[PDB]
Ligand binder design. Structure first.
Ligand SMILES: O=c1ccn([C@@H]2O[C@H](COP(=O)(O)O)[C@@H](O)[C@H]2O)c(=O)[nH]1
Ligand SMILES: O=c1ccn([C@@H]2O[C@H](COP(=O)(O)O)[C@@H](O)[C@H]2O)c(=O)[nH]1
Lengths: 208, 208
């Protein structure tokens, strides 16, 4: 599918401090939440409009309201929770589901481990969120997880992504669009995005 | 100058409930604040970017930060304060100035009455805010007020505006751009925008 880069100068600005190694855990946490809300605005620019008829204190009028559709925000444990409340600010109605993944010794990919979703799965559109899209491993497992439960609308959103990871998602799931804030250049032997921002989880929780 | 209409479906959605006569003062207040923050995002999409060199926990990097410029938010008493904090959320650094206007018995236009601005006036760009742009009377008086103090960058932003009021501003100040969320059709004998939303001040403060 297509990848959308959100280049708003405010996102770009906050992203810079998010990357800087000197930004402590508290600022990091707060900055990600902010960039999360900002991207939520850009992404929801799609929401279908239906027009009703209201009546202001002056006269009647033809206004518009949001189409009426169910939304689902699903963070990938653990660094994923860092971007939920930010999105929930704009869409308080959206339901929140979580997904855990485990990794085995001699394997090349993560695997579904813990899944909790809202019961109306078949109906609502979902947005899987995770700060980093590296090898695409965790993202793919997560989407496979959702498709298996029958959600037919899946979008992925992250701050920073690596080419390989984007390709991994394209290949495995061409029907899923990707929303990123920046596309870095590559991965290193340990799987970190370069230049990236280090370990999202540690920077967020300030703990292991 | 040019008028920019922000048609984001979220703004359109919230605007509808803002107009509805049945929305009580508390929701109104809160809804305006929200639409204010949302418009603040759209308007600041301009902010110039300068690129610095940071160093993430993984490697060095070339990032961008906001140009560095001073901003001023100036509400027109009284319904103007309803949109300040919403904007301040995105730009906490911006300074806040107020402007009061009085009206005399046999006159056709408002007039500067109370003015308090940050001292760096000559330097910073300002955004005058007021929920409604009706006859354009109050807006013009307000801009005249700022130009007289030597601010050379002035933008006007409101929720709903009437054609006459837009024209009034164009005529009196062609160098000021206008940012609105909706352009209604006309004014009635009492000066209210049709369909509009009634008296912004009463709906906001719930008092006279
Ligand atoms: O530089 C990186 C790369 C990955 N991850 C995290 O490691 C997990 C594995 O991503 P992936 O390698 O499966 O793409 C994801 O939860 C992601 O947030 C980071 O925190 N920093
Ligand atoms: O329908 C309207 C028209 C105007 N005003 C308020 O009355 C003042 C006068 O605007 P104007 O007639 O000078 O344009 C402004 O502060 C504006 O917010 C309203 O509350 N509702």
């Amino acid at each position: 599918g297509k990848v959308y880069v959100f280049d708003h100068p405010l996102i770009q600005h906050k992203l810079t401090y998010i990357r800087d190694k000197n930004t402590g855990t508290k600022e990091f946490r707060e900055l990600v939440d902010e960039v999360a809300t900002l991207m939520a605005f850009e992404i929801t620019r799609d929401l279908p409009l239906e027009e009703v008829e209201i009546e202001t204190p002056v006269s009647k009028a033809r206004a518009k309201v949001i189409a009426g559709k169910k939304l689902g925000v699903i963070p990938i444990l653990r660094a994923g929770i860092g971007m939920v409340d930010g999105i929930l600010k704009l869409i308080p109605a959206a339901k929140v589901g979580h997904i855990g993944l485990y990794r085995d010794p001699q394997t090349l990919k993560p695997v579904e481990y813990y899944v909790k979703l809202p019961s109306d799965v078949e109906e609502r559109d979902f947005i899987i969120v995770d700060p980093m899209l590296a090898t695409g491993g965790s993202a793919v497992a997560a989407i496979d997880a959702l498709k298996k439960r029958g959600a037919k609308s899946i979008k992925f959103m992250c701050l920073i992504a690596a080419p390989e990871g984007v390709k991994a998602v394209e290949t495995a799931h061409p029907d899923v669009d990707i929303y990123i804030a920046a596309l870095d250049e590559r991965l290193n032997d340990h799987g970190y995005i370069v230049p990236g921002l280090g370990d999202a989880g540690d920077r967020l929780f300030g703990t292991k």
